[model samples]
Target: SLPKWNQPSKEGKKITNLFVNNSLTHSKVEFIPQEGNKIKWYACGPTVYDAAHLGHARTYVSFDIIRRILVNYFKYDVFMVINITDIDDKIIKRSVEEKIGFTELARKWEYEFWEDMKSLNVLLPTAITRVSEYVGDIVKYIEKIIENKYAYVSEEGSVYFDIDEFKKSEKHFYARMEPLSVKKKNAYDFALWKSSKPNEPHWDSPWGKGRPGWHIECSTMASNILGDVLDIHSGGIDLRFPHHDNELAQSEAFFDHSQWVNYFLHSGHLHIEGLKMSKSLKNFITIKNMLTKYTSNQIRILFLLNKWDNFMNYSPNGESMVQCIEIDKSFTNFFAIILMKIKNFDLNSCNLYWSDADNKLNLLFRQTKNKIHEHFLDNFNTPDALLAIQKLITEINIYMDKEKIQIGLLLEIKHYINFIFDTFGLIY
Candidate 1:
């Protein structure tokens, strides 16, 4: 385990240690940025072919908490870049079917995706790169991979990453995440550029006319903005297979290094009633609809109660929501009592001697802070950190049962709780 705080254990020390589950190594490791204290983070954003669903919310909201904890608690200077995949097979198909221009449709849903994210209180990234905006850069990136002999252009003018050639190199290895699936002959080889067909959106390239492939879009955009090396690359856990693996391959090949990203943060799958939430499964809930009923705080509480990288189960009318409701009520009542006591404090009682109970409460409050910090350090264990805060609230309530209340003590604890809440983004 890492050091618990920046200073001595018993001193007024803040948390100094941090760890994260890095998917590349498939283990929890201490989080140290390649640079001094700066984190170059990139996350894969929405495809924008349709409405943003709960699955999308689960991923973005979970990452938001992790990002917040890193910046707010750990005090890392994080420059985040999230890429919007505006052009893809899904976008082209949807646009042609609806007889709407591809750009118009992508922007409309892109606007909706941002609206959903804002309603959920997710912080905006430092930079947002769109695939459509980076076509020229992506072409350049593909050209480099080809020049490096890691990718090849097909007779149809489409470019595919040559897994065989890449693996033959001493430093390169394919399928970093999982074993290559044998579903097809080219299962391991993925597209770097797709030759455009008739009646579709097209961009001119050395390969005649085409657009960047799905996997290469993120690689080109992220590298263009954040440089060759990235501190963190984040996305849904499902993307680990072809999407993220190919991203690693492309960037590593482009930069001629074994590692392009230091840490890969993957948010776990979101399921509803033992099944993954999907529009095809008919078990999807839109973020807009969820907010119309529950407050944004309530929704966040539901996510905060679970591990960010675990397979989280969701239910609109399940015990999780009930737990959130009760927790909100507890905080509401706790604050109300504290506010009333503060408003009517007896000024002459300022010099009153501290009781044994007061000393115990004060000790417990510091211990709770330490516990929460430890929990946060241990792979960003938010559920236990939140539980620590809740336990402190319970202890405070127990102490309040005494005939005489300590207004100053209660106020300090109140502000501390608010600080944690704000750090967690539970409050606006």
Candidate 2:
């Protein structure tokens, strides 16, 4: 028989090695935390110009699964931090278009964003630092970069990170993706601070009355909260370009660290059909609309069905949604049937025969448990873990549908199913 699934393993080494780097080496690499047994995980949160769409849901849910595994399966204490870009150019233009105060517009959309996060049951990040809250700190950080000669103040009072100088100083650059800026002196240079416009939000800085730039706030806020070197940094793959590249340059340059971040975990974007989702395409679906059609567990199954690093399609015609809903029902109904049949049964009957079928059932359960653990340990191959769960469910149904099941076997089967549910955050 399979060793009981309820016994939790004590292995710190596996937890540390769960995440694969973007490329090299996409291997199960070690993640030794700065503080023992605790990780300061920084994920780029949403900018509150509008409601969060399915793309945002996909990324955040992907990280939430990772976080849940780190906490529940690996038994690590994680201090998760996500940055809210409330002072973005998008927010400014949005507010102007709405004929409302910037703060009012930001608060409105920020409220909506949190509501959706709650609706989707996104694991609450330990800290959600807003750009508006860290404007002064960002300005001070930019000044430090300026003093170090990695940044320059423009004639218009805006500060820009000198990518040429940064590249010259830091031997390692662009671990993943780099952006080109046609407006900067060097194509790779990005803004550190933008001089405030007449009606824009302003903060007093050494340069002038201006606000922090897009890239600077993330570096400054993450540094201000988590210090120089972070254990893991996460965001959408799209951010790998200008946004994340800029953050990396400014951070490594500012801290003078060889590697400012240990891991960059970028989740794939959610796209519709062959076209990218957009307001213009009318295929832009929100998490709220999805919540209306599907349960949280159903959505999670959809996410876990695919590898975290790859984009999974959400067909606008509701094909994927229907498919996932059927999957959820498959697990849910089987779970209910098991509970109903075995809830009152006693497992202490020694009058049972160790039948070949019984032994074979438990053996299947053992293999399923092993498959689940194997995938989970190897850079969190949740899709395969889930596949194992599905196989167990199918085998269980076939067995139950065919022969009479023993109370002892049913008890073990319950653990087998719930174990996957708990480990992967698929539980309702």
Candidate 3:
């Protein structure tokens, strides 16, 4: 018999060879799933009070690129779960302010979120759980933790995770990913359930009318969808400290296990121009608004030029942004120039021959291919992989300029680059 907290087995793969920078250890670790090559991934999704923005772009798009690499290049079966937080403080406030129902407000923004994600070409998650839909499940999840002696009910009829109690457990540690601080009764204890107030959404639970806390939403949704242990759990870096930390404590407490998530992958923050994106700062650009100015491919190209784990800057006038545009333009020019050549002369009409130049280009292709693969293995080094592609393009340009370019060989090189672009999901 399985535990109540544990989901049914997601029975499903291949030889796995990929190293990722695991946030749990703050180091590169080889990715070996608990069950063969099948990877169970959970990503904490957006809270839908407003439209999705560039910050969402940096995390989801970056993961999508990595996901594609894993599925297309490394050949791993990834079953990814993303949760939509439909109930939250922000959603409640926004609903009241706009004089709309909370569910109506959440549903609107949730629809907008998916539209934005589709525009950006982010791959759909295998399963999506909504916090509002999983409130009963979350209540049961919290009940189990309280029974496990890691959580307690407050006088206010709210439930809070007992940090001190969690720490006292010899089998588990608190806040393993982030070294952060004190709050409520005990220094680091967090809310598992918040007692509802007037004009706010509420659900009937063992603790009267209240809602699930921010951290518990993800924990319950992930546990119910992904089972007791997860191969990977990802989110933005800001979640590392209190949010992700509390998630670990609550989950491990419920399961009575040491580790709940094997790998914690936190994508880096995103800045607009040189400053952080803030509504008060007047620099916040929604994904919908940005899509109007730039194509999805252009936005994804900007993300690809930067490493996933490093803070990324999206400056309209910055050197890096211009560099991405130039790189894209180069690819466009190469394709156009090569396509024109193909139209003028048929592949069958050309005398197929391999010269010294063709042989050298072939060698360069193999070298570049090997380098790109190596960089990907080295923690999905997309920026370097992108540079390698640029280098290959430059060499191809030089080869075409200097020698009697063999259509067969030249087309083969073009096709290879096309394949790389497709793999990177940079193709429009």
Candidate 4:
């Protein structure tokens, strides 16, 4: 029987417990709770200067699965926030190059990003905050850091975190996230506010006229929305070094809290044709371009064919597409076989599987469910989990060809299949 949403099963509890115990340090996982009910999640959202790419898909989709499991299975009230980087050096440069206003540039690409995410069936975040709209809040955060003596002001109107000061208090904290211990003078040293460039986005601050630096935007926004501590902070693995590390240093130094985030989740990058998809190489494929060539469902299935943390290389010769086709066919064939069995049997209730199915079929059903959980808990090994699920489907097809199957069993398997599909944004 499925456990109540509030009362997860033993396996479910194991998975949740694992996440709670492992806090984010470097590439580790951890979960911190707040008020026992509400969990604050701050994921690094996309910068709006360019179109969303496959890398964005891999990161967001993995988090989407995490969000679904927490909300649906664990019954946790999660507030997931994704920041839209509407103001940045890159955005300003792109705006000028495109001969448009900064706001116009952000608007155009931000809308496109929304459409792409929707197409991937990623659950919409609770709130999407833009950097430009949070300028006042960001300034307030900078002021607090400065007042707390965690930051220093330069004559250029830029405020840099006093890494030297923070290091004196907590020498080992920054090293936990990034293992570089010998060279740095201060662990908390990072730009809190950047001096305005000649043609970049600018706002007035106490020190002078300037803009929030790249790392400061996330720290300020996360602190403002999620408070001094966050339950989960997720992003790509690339952000661990300078981006997430900087946020941790600056925020912890200002707040005077050693534990600022409960968990730090990161997804590995996606490769195309054996190479990383990058704009510099002119080989990056946007979501729109992929959609024109492949259906969303197909892409999702392809993605889930591998674990989220593992790098996926997409190519015509890869096994992902072939595996997806086989899985899709198995589901189709299993559903048809079940329907045929139902036509031969008379069933009035949903619990007839135990009596109607023979011993072998009954054993297979239990084994399938067990195997699914086994793989799911082992770091969310989707590829292995999917293989187990497909095996169950194949078994059902075989049984349907021999004897009358219970209608309830058919529905149960169908629901399970749909659940897998929904979990990964895979369409059949």
lDDT against the true structure, per candidate, is 0.84, 0.77, 0.83, 0.72
Considering TM-score, which of the candidate structures 2 and 4 is the better prediction for this target? 2
Q: What stretches of model 4 exceed 4 Å from their correct place?
A: 1-15, 19-38, 181-188, 316-320, 336-357
- Screening candidate 3 with a backbone cut-off below 3 angstroms (N, C-alpha, C), the clashing residue pairs are 182-187, 183-187
TM-score of each: 0.93, 0.89, 0.92, 0.87
Question: Lowest lDDT 10-mer window, candidate 4?
Answer: 1-10
The lDDT-based order of candidates, best leading, equals 1, 3, 2, 4
Pairs of colliding residues, candidate 2: none
Winner on lDDT between 1 and 4 is 1
Measured by lDDT, the strongest candidate is: 1
Clashes of 4: 6
Tens digits of per-residue lDDT for model 2, 202-273:
989888888888888899999998998777888987787678767877887788766676667778888889
Candidate 1's displacement at residue 8, Å, is: 25
What's the residue-level lDDT of 146 in candidate 1? 91
Candidate 4, position 101, lDDT: 95
- Clash number for model 2? 0
Specify the highest-TM-score model's number. 1
